[PDB]
Amino acid sequence: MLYIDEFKEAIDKGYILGDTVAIVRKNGKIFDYVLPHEKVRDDEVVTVERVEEVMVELDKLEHHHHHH
């Protein structure tokens, strides 16, 4: 699974430019981003997604515990 830190860094460093991005999902979960010209295998499903929507989906894997 892809996590938010890597995704945000790829945006900050200019690998993921713009408002939509190619994504591969497995079982509905995001497993990687795919950059222009990168190759995928036949069993991979590549969709174009909103960068903001990806950021919400990746938040589902973050820790939110806020009691101490």
Author numbering: 1 to 68
Original paper wording:
Work describing the contribution of bacteriophages to the emergence and diversification of the M1T1 GAS clone revealed that each prophage contains a conserved open reading frame (ORF) of ~60aa named paratox (prx). prx is always located adjacent to a toxin within the prophage, and GAS prophages that lack a toxin also lack prx. In our efforts to study the regulation of natural competence in Streptococcus spp. by ComRS based quorum sensing, we discovered that prx genes contain a perfect CIN-box within their promoter region for recognition by the SigX core-RNA-polymerase complex, and that transcription of prx is induced by XIP. Additionally, we found that Prx binds ComR directly and inhibits activation by XIP both in vitro and in vivo. Taken together we conclude that the conserved prophage protein paratox acts as an inhibitor of new DNA acquisition by pyogenic, bovis and suis streptococci.
Additionally, an X-ray crystal structure of Prx reveals a novel protein fold with only distant structural homologues, which suggests a unique molecular mechanism of ComR-XIP inhibition. Prx crystallized as a dimer in the asymmetric unit. The dimer interface consists of residues from β-strands β1, β3 and the loop region between β2 and β3, which allows the N and C terminal α-helices to be positioned on the same face of the complex. As calculated by MOLEonline/2.531, the pore or cavity sizes are 380Å3 and 993Å3. Although analysis by SEC indicates a possible dimer, analysis with PISA32 gives a complex significance score of 0.1, which suggests a high probability that dimerization is a crystal packing artifact. As demonstrated by analytical ultracentrifugation (AUC), Prx is a monomer (8.39 kDa) in the buffer conditions used in our biochemical experiments. A surface composed of one face of α1 (D5, L8, and E9) and α2 (M55, V46) also cluster into a conserved patch, and both surfaces tend toward an electronegative electrostatic potential. The observed Prx dimer appears superficially similar to a Bateman fold, with each Prx monomer as the individual CBS (cystathionine β-synthase) domain37 as shown in an alignment with human AMP-activated kinase.
